[PDB]
Design a binder for this molecule. Structure first.
Ligand code: HEM
Ligand code: 04Y
Length: 434
């Protein structure tokens, strides 16, 4: 009854249903999500008001499935899932040092070496006939980049190593999904314990290295440790280990996979991207940091890919006091749902919204004003945004330099939702050298 007055109903995902309801019922609509009543707010005025203010905190009820799954602590109170402002702010300020401009410039060697490894593996299969899962190959690349860049760890998933780790990540993502019988419970719980035990093993290795006075370059793990200096126990440390182990590869992989999928049906845009990489980097194996800013059309293509295919569709804020939102009375203690997926597909905000058009992000084009937020906005925006944008530009630039991709017929463009949105199909392609 407390929500009955709010407007609403009486390879598809629930976000497509929400899109249909926002179009039909307007900027404030009641929905059921993760078995709670929520209100989806899709005006840009609401996005600005609620996301650009430290007055509005995340609604912790809507993060339970990242905190704990089936009674196993997962991300716990790490940086994504901590919804207390002061507890979040303390860790954010310490971990931010690992995402400074100087920190990220130092990661270009890791980005280049893993991108070069992927392209060499793909070139050996570029016979126009062997089907390759670009979803799988881009996930292995993203995991290898993250493990090296964040932790100084070589996972070598691109060599076929760490299969139990790859399986554990897959079942943990299925667990998040199922949360929000007997064998699936056992497999999910053991996978979460395995990921935390990877953290314990790697933190002990880092501590022993530091004790023996071995050289350890400052990385994300350095700052994760710094945030816990004088903690009562290692459970905060492991919460952020697992948070960054998962967060630092999965959305990047999703975004790469979506971009390759969509580009397979955009031959003219691919010819333009191939030309731009030819003009900017030439034959050079290695992209320098200053080359990234020169790949302007690729930047636009990746922004348009996130408009239609945001791996992280949005966020929630807790409305504490009854508030009028776009002419609608919204009760206190309500989860407000913000969706860049829904707003990206509304003709109100984007003309011909299903058309893939990188020129929407061109230099003279008007910037979306609070209608586009694939890294969210405000104080709780993605800490990894610049990390992600650099690594994906390096991977995509190296693929475009060296290879041609054709999507295998029968492969779909639809979505699935696990913890994030990702292609329904494996993005199975045949390849040829340029
Ligand atoms: C294309 C890639 C990526 C996308 C689309 C993405 C998207 C997002 C979004 C929408 C949020 C806000 C989530 C919320 O409000 O609940 C977020 C937060 C976060 N992301 Fe990402 N992300 C990406 C890459 C990364 C990477 C590479 C890392 C780490 C290296 C990372 C770590 C995080 C963390 C730790 C947070 C929580 C930040 C905070 O609240 O202070 N993300 N991301
Ligand atoms: O569960 C979430 N929000 C709850 C309201 C429902 C999102 C929180 C932000 N997440 C990320 C953000 N940056 C990078 C990666 C992830 C990521 C990917 C895989 C698994 C976990 C997290 C995406 C999920």
């Amino acid at each position: 009854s407390r929500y009955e007055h709010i407007p609403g109903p009486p390879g598809r995902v629930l976000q497509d249903v929400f899109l249909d309801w926002a179009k039909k019922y307007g900027p404030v609509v009641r929905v059921n999500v993760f078995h709670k009543t929520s209100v989806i707010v899709t005006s840009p005025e609401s996005v600005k008001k609620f996301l650009m203010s430290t007055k509005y905190n995340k609604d912790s009820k809507m993060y339970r499935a990242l905190q704990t799954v089936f009674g196993e602590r997962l991300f716990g109170q790490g940086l994504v899932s901590e919804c207390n402002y002061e507890r979040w702010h303390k860790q954010r300020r310490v971990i931010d040092l690992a995402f400074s401009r100087s920190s990220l410039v130092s990661l270009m060697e890791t980005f280049n070496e893993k991108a070069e490894q992927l392209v060499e593996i793909l070139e050996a299969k570029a016979d126009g006939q062997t089907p390759v899962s670009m979803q799988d190959m881009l996930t292995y690349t993203a995991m290898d980049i993250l493990a090296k860049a964040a932790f100084g760890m070589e996972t070598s998933m691109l060599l076929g190593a760490q299969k139990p780790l790859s399986q554990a990540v897959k079942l943990m993502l299925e667990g998040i999904t199922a949360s929000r019988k007997r064998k699936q419970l056992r497999e999910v719980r053991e996978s979460i314990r395995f990921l935390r035990q990877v953290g314990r093993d790697w933190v002990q290795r880092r501590r022993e290295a530091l004790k023996r006075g071995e050289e350890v370059p400052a990385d994300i793990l350095t700052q994760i440790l710094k945030a816990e200096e004088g903690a009562q126990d290692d459970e905060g440390l492991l919460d952020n280990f697992v948070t960054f182990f998962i967060a630092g590869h999965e959305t990047s992989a999703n975004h790469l996979a979506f971009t390759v999928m969509e580009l397979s049906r955009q031959p003219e845009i691919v010819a333009r991207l191939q030309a731009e990489v030819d003009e900017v980097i030439g034959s050079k194996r290695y992209l320098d940091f200053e080359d990234l800013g020169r790949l302007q059309y690729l930047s636009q293509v990746l922004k348009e890919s996130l408009r239609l295919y945001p791996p992280a569709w949005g966020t929630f804020r807790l409305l504490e006091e009854e508030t009028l939102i776009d002419g609608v009375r919204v009760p206190g203690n309500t989860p407000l749902l913000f969706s860049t997926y829904v707003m990206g597909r509304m003709d109100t905000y984007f003309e011909d919204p299903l058309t893939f058009n990188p020129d929407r992000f061109g230099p003279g084009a008007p910037k979306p004003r609070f209608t586009y937020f694939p890294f969210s906005l405000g104080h709780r925006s993605c800490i990894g945004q610049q990390f992600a944008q650099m690594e994906v530009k390096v991977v995509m630039a190296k693929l475009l330099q060296r290879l041609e991709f054709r999507l295998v017929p029968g492969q779909r463009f639809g979505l699935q939702e696990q913890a994030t949105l990702k292609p329904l199909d494996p993005v199975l392609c045949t390849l040829r050298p340029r």
